[model samples]
Target: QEPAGRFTKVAAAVADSVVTIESVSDQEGMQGSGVIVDGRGYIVTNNHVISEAANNPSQFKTTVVFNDGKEVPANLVGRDPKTDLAVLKVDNVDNLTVARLGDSSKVRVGDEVLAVGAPLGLRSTVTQGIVSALHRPVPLSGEGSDTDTVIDAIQTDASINHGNAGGPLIDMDAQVIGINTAGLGFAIPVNEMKLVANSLIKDGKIVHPTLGISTRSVSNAIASGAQVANVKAGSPAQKGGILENDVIVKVGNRAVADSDEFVVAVRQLAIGQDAPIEVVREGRHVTLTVKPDPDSTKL
Candidate 1:
């Protein structure tokens, strides 16, 4: 809602503090961005970016650097493969710029935004674009069966790339509405990211709020409805009287038609709380009250 030109100014300010994370493994290196979300040098990024570094304690070393040319040491707070989110805490930093939060739920198409990240080590490169689309069915063709992160995503053509993950997708007002999580340089909205970000920064993991179910987007393979493939044992679905082969059509009060949408809608849930789970059974709508089981990570 602020002047559009001010967006760049905010972007510069926000980019100065966030970091580009270089996580190293024996054979390869994964890249992503990080936001200095807290004053004590807490940063937020996508979990996939830091999974190797986090899971590997013996050989992995995390190299964190910011756009302002400052280097710092950091450790992973938590990483959630489900949401593709992770958090980091660096020591000995002050005067950091925490991004302004945006309303991802209200974001619409054609909304102008900016992306901040160190592309290929370029450092804090700024790209501009409008919100191209929302709830896009991420092309997880072969990875759907696995418990992958980034279940739901906000797709923006802001020129994001591999190293851009964890950067801030800022709006015209200079607030960070989304994290540069994944896609072909697309930005994922931050409204849903708050859960995991908060958990990582505070508790070193996303805690509480589980659904115990996996779903796929309604596509040609399963156009009838969401493809509910796996249900966790004793999970909310198992306890709430939900079953596989059932298409989830609604989450609480919101309506959905595709399985991909269920991923995004599930983030709409209130952590540590229960909500009504709705599905399409026998061509009719059936609802159940299920509490999201809490995972160590929120993203």
Candidate 2:
């Protein structure tokens, strides 16, 4: 049952946990929003929001503005540019409110949600909307030096703007289901963010699995699949006998239709897990076992 003033109630419940982030690097300044995910002063925000500071720590500074207008300096704990997620830490802070995390897998289209952020430097702004779509593949480009960050994101029309990045998309129960990343209303799923955040918190970096091959989609009257264009020397692909010109048909149990699909499939591979990869070479089908390696150098 829908309750009266539910949005108001949600805003009141989560206001203390939402924070405005200010970053400065050289002569450039950027503003964004973040949410407190731990009572001990751990905050989660987008990597792009703090990219300059994280990239050049010596020349950069970051601050967190709390609900009561208290400002505190923050340090970058870790950042994963490939996922567009980052964590910050503050010391000697107390009485913090941590937002409850929700299961993003259960979020469906048309579910009511609120976006909490500081849009255009307006602090503690709230916008209401419904989940417009799910599993949206958004390729975020030029945000970092690495390859494009592709997010299987949640789409909303919650009036996200320039300063809204790194804010929380809240459910009716005031739980955080997504982290806002784009101005046009796209968010990284909380489930994926959790994985990245946890790893970054623990290791100061994410150990992403890599196949070490560049590919392109090939289609003809004969066949269509992702064709391996190059294999990095001494990489997992080369070690697993993957050669250039081999058309990849399957990775594990998922069928590869194109290069994008192949990229998604590779992302699902567990680190150090041996998986079967099927490819076509010279009209002959071959299967090879490739153990994905934890490679931080490539996305």
Candidate 3:
């Protein structure tokens, strides 16, 4: 189900619809991938992808490259950091075909996928990989807060590179599963991109998942799984029997390749849903259908 020989042809079929996202700056500046989610030219992408340039064009020049090699000046609709998503609108796009969205929740481990976007300014570069995991936590090595946002992402092994940020991670069916956000090449799963991508499109911000639980960061070399640091009373973790010092090894189809990732992944969870959760406890794996706190960000 992955992109293969002649898949370039398939990718090209849709590439024209994907435009290289540029900051609002006038000359020579760009950020991430932009998908025309609406026929009216409402495009969705990561907030961090377009903001710096949008707010301060003096530093961020705005210009987008099309697949046909045309440069078009674009306008910013809005952006939100909570979800890390942004929206842009372009006029005269009445003829553009919008990319289709797929339910990321149905994605699974080993499901092959593609990365479509302008990596390093290359138009419509398509790469391939599998759904390595899902509902992954806070990305490790970030200088930020974990529980502040629910970014439960669609984790994949699809070679997402620096230039690949903000691209579309497509599925076998040509449906856009997620917009590229962050993570390492092999260590972190890629599917979590989906968890927050849709929200980024619809609302322009990440809505953090609330299981009403908290955990401390740990290293894989020490625990071989994620460690629980704290839990909100009567929250998902507490209700499901997750405890401090417990090591998390699995969540749905994703594997905890390291301890730290598990913690960061959970912080992105959405609340009030009874989802299947798995973790490692004292060398044993445990599975629980847990209910998370509803969007704690909701008013």
All candidates in order of lDDT, best leading: 2, 1, 3
Model 1: how far residue 105 lies from native, Å: 3.2
Question: Among these predicted structures, which one has the highest TM-score?
Answer: 2
Residues forming the 10-long window of minimal summed lDDT in candidate 2: 118-127
lDDT by residue (118-172, candidate 3, tens digit) is 6336443567788878665444231223223334567777777646666677777
TM-score of each: 0.79, 0.85, 0.62
Better of 1 and 3 by TM-score: 1
Name the candidate, 2 or 3, with the larger TM-score value: 2
- Give per-residue CA lDDT, model 1, range 48-167, as digits (tens): 667667777678778787666677677877766666667787887766766567788888889888877753365436778888887664533213233644356667877876546678
Tens-place lDDT digits, model 2, residues 1-299: 35648888887788888888898777888788998998889999988888877777787789998988888999889988777888999888989989899999999999999988853256446788999998775677745465576667899988776656798999988999999887458888899888888988897888777899989889753338889999998888999999999999898887877776677678778986799999999899999889898866455
Alpha-carbon lDDT, every model: 0.70, 0.84, 0.62
Per-candidate alpha-carbon RMSD to the true structure: 4.5, 3.7, 6.1
